[PDB]
Design a protein around this ligand. Sequence first.
Ligand code: FAD
Ligand code: FAD
Lengths: 401, 401
Amino acid sequence: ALKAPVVVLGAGLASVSFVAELRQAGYQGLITVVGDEAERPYDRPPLSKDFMAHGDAEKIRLDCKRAPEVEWLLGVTAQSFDPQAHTVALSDGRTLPYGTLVLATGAAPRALPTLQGATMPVHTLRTLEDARRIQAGLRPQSRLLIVGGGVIGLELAATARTAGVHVSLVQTKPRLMSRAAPATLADFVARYHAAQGVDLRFERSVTGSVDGVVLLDDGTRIAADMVVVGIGVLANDALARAAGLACDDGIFVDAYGRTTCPDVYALGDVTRQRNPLSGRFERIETWSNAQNQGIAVARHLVDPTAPGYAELPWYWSDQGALRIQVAGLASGDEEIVRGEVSLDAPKFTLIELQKGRIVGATCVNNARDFAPLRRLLAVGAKPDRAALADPATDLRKLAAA
Amino acid sequence: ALKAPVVVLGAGLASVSFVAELRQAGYQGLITVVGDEAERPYDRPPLSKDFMAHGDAEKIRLDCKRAPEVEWLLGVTAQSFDPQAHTVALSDGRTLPYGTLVLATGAAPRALPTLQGATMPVHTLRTLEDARRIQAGLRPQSRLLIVGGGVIGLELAATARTAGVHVSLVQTKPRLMSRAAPATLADFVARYHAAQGVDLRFERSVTGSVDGVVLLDDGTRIAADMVVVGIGVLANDALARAAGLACDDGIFVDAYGRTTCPDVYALGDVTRQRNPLSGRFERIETWSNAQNQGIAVARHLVDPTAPGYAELPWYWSDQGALRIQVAGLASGDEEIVRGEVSLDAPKFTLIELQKGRIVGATCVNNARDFAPLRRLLAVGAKPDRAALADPATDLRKLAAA
Ligand SMILES: Cc1cc2nc3c(=O)[nH]c(=O)nc-3n(C[C@H](O)[C@H](O)[C@H](O)COP(=O)(O)OP(=O)(O)OC[C@H]3O[C@@H](n4cnc5c(N)ncnc54)[C@H](O)[C@@H]3O)c2cc1C
Ligand SMILES: Cc1cc2nc3c(=O)[nH]c(=O)nc-3n(C[C@H](O)[C@H](O)[C@H](O)COP(=O)(O)OP(=O)(O)OC[C@H]3O[C@@H](n4cnc5c(N)ncnc54)[C@H](O)[C@@H]3O)c2cc1C
């Protein structure tokens, strides 16, 4: 089952969380981690947040303390693995044996085909190197165009506006945060960004670019000094595909993290896995999944009596004055709005229900509500809906009881 | 790898094909097949075709000759399996041990929620029992309503019209055969059925039924003596789900038929698997997949040097005077029409191309063209497109050369 030695491909959050849990759970055999970035393992959420603003990479490193006795091969790329021979081929000419192989290779930004031959700066934002490159171009009064209205693009928009950068944003869908964000939240977020001076363009797509100017499918133009593309990510599943594992923009895994290849597991952004709320497979793209799935897979490898991964999805986003938290599903058959939705000191909570059962929640500038809502969500609570609306109600009381 | 004894759950085409290939490839260990239907293994395509018309089940049995030394437990249901203990629990109180378990449990017709409490005959068409029940109600001059415009519904429509039954058909999508059929084919097929007296209703859905009359979402009614629902199927993946395998309306498998659980494989209609043409995972619902995937998985179990499953998708449908064959993808960036599309002695070929490469083909009443087209499709041929259109061209010549 858990056969030594353990080899993990990728040295991001999922990998670090996994190897720390292996050690904490009592596994004492070899652990070797192969990471292609020549960087002390680091967390990505700061890259479009405080790092983009203040630039200190020594504030964003992951804690590998709970992972003693691990050899981290940084700056080296796993090029293939042979699941029959139980070996991994590295870019430095070495080969690693494994008893258990764990693919934690994450995902990479999708390129925008229409900007392939661009002769102006076009960047994506995934790595520390990416963040440093973008930051170097955030000149005050310069013009930035962001393609894509997902959370990372919006976080960059906010950061850029704070830095005195003019920002335009092109979104093909009619709303921001089209993936896993309630419409009510998305509409409010657009109003917020518009009020901060972001030039939002909905239902437009980029058709190309010429001499520092981007072209749109409504026949118009947007001049910019830099483009940052953020239209989503694609799983880094090439090694799995080549080795014969089941993959489709993501490695399919069960709740134990098992791939279709015996002795090969996968975790984090690279996986396509069951969302327990929808009961469908999806590629989850969140910090909490990377950490939680890594921990759960490790725990069950060391102790097979442990349950499989079962945590429900959630994320957060920091966009200027908006501290956004979202859990579960973006929609059901009912939304309850707790508080007023207003640009004047924004503070509200949304609750999504399905036939009376909580299936999702949102908090904007209300961290205290979010924890009890996630507990109610976890057990599929069916609370009195007037109480959920009634601002006199205390959610922590409800969650404990 | 291939560990004896072998246990297969399900006794349909995929199972029979798999166990016959195990024997032909030289595996001599135990094989036991558990089949819930108390029927000599039989093929399903005749059920909406010649069987529905002539009623002789002894013309539709599968050949288990190439599968000697197999114990077939007919009329018994596998209730669960324990992948740790390597056992299967049967409905008759017995337990089977396995070295290799193969899930070939197929799929079952989706029920129509709006007809759940119906007080008129409502059937689906999957099994021999289903076919016999429907056939018993095909009284001449009776009225049949079919819900769903997939191939099986259309085959039943044709059979019913031939039997003198009045037929109406409700399809929610704007075209028939919305799944994997080129629009050009679908439009022609509608014209054909309309000309044979089928009352087609597009872009309508069933909202309910009252006293022998079905209600539609345009506020209208259709009276019928029998409803046959054919809005698709759902994978029979309950045992896999309960045992912890990765599933999502279908058991995920790689090209070797491996599930996420070691020593457990899956084949046929129950699987979600890579379509090599699209490069995406899909649940394939075809006779050729059931046979071909079963054979390929068996071959590779006995001989691990054999390639994984690699066949490209295709199916056929017999609808009255229309002998339809479809291979590959329903669309690309180009369609070439070979011949005239006409209700007067229908006979034509479609070819779908993507950047010059053949990615799909259709033949209506032209079996001789279909085989060379599938060969061109298999190697991704990029033939001269004027020649593909030019009716003077011989496709068999092209395929050999
Ligand atoms: C800018 C940014 C902001 C974000 N903000 C938030 C947030 O506020 N909240 C939130 O919920 N989530 C956020 N996320 C998402 C989050 O960070 C991811 O879900 C998380 O990084 C996934 O971790 P991972 O370990 O699975 O993958 P990764 O972090 O991508 O780590 C995988 C590593 O493996 C490497 N690798 C790939 N292939 C190979 C190979 N063949 N050999 C060796 N190494 C390889 C990769 O280069 C990478 O270093 C953000 C992400 C970004 C980029
Ligand atoms: C009416 C009809 C017409 C068709 N026409 C065509 C056609 O012209 N061309 C074409 O390409 N395809 C056609 N098909 C599709 C085709 O027949 C299927 O793709 C094929 O039957 C799939 O084979 P299978 O072995 O995977 O599944 P199945 O045939 O469904 O066999 C699975 C068996 O396992 C049984 N089972 C399920 N669970 C258990 C359990 N727990 N224990 C024991 N047994 C279990 C099932 O009841 C079933 O008997 C048609 C299908 C139907 C129903």
